[PDB]
């Protein structure tokens, strides 16, 4: 794996191990080809829009690879494990730790000095299935 791929995969697994019964991810070359193509074509507008593809997806603007994973994960501060499910400010975290997700692949592209890096990670199987959060988003162990 490349330095970007290794550091990003490692950051996912460092976080997932903090949670009960959550296995590590592996890198997928096909997922990364998908994500890097979307990163290649990103319009550097400052707006984050999902690709609408078949995989799970996390997006960030202004962080390198590992720092993006860190920011996604830090949404745990808004997650109420007593009331699991989706919210606009927890969906990145729940995809990072989604138990049934087994593979991740990501891409990156600079958007200049005013935006920093655009980072997209694609996930297979996808996370954030409504009604399945309790089975796939475990509490801190
Ligand atoms: Mg996103």
Residue numbers in the entry: 159 to 299
Which lines from the publication concern this structure?
Two crystal structures of the CAP domain of pathogen-related yeast protein from Saccharomyces cerevisiae, Pry1CAP, are presented. Our previous studies revealed that Saccharomyces cerevisiae CAP proteins are required for the export of sterols in vivo and they bind cholesterol in vitro. The sterol binding and export properties of these proteins are localized to the CAP domain, which is sufficient to rescue sterol export properties of cells lacking endogenous Pry proteins. The overall monomer surface area for Pry1CAP is 7125 Å2 and its topology is an alpha-beta-alpha sandwich made up of 6 helices, 2 disulfide bonds, 12 beta turns and 1 beta bulge.
In the second structure Mg2+ is coordinated by the CAP cavity tetrad residues. In one Pry1CAP structure, a magnesium ion from the crystallization solution is coordinated by the tetrad which results in a slight shift in the histidines when compared to the structure without the divalent cation. The CAP cavity tetrad residues of Pry1CAP (His208, Glu215, Glu233 and His247) superpose well with the corresponding residues from representative CAP proteins8111329. Electron density for four 1,4-dioxane molecules were observed in the initial molecular replacement 2Fo − Fc maps when dioxane was present in the crystallization solution; this density is absent in the Mg2+ structure, which does not have 1,4-dioxane in the crystallization solution. Furthermore, cholesterol binding by Pry1CAP is inhibited by EDTA and adding magnesium ions restores sterol binding, indicating that magnesium is important for sterol binding by Pry1CAP. The observation that EDTA inhibits cholesterol binding and that addition of Mg2+ restores cholesterol binding by Pry1 is surprising since the cholesterol binding CBM and the CAP tetrad that binds Mg2+ are located at distinct sites in the Pry1CAP monomer. The cholesterol and Mg2+ binding sites are distinct and unconnected in the Pry1CAP monomer. Mg2+ dependent sterol binding by Pry1CAP requires the interaction of both binding sites, likely occuring via dimerization, because Pry1CAP forms dimers in solution, and both crystal structures have a crystallographic dimer in which the CBM and CAP tetrad are connected within a large 7063 Å3 volume cleft. Pry1CAP is a dimer in solution and the cholesterol and Mg2+ binding sites are connected by a large cleft in a crystallographic dimer, providing a structural basis for Mg2+ -dependent sterol binding by Pry1CAP.
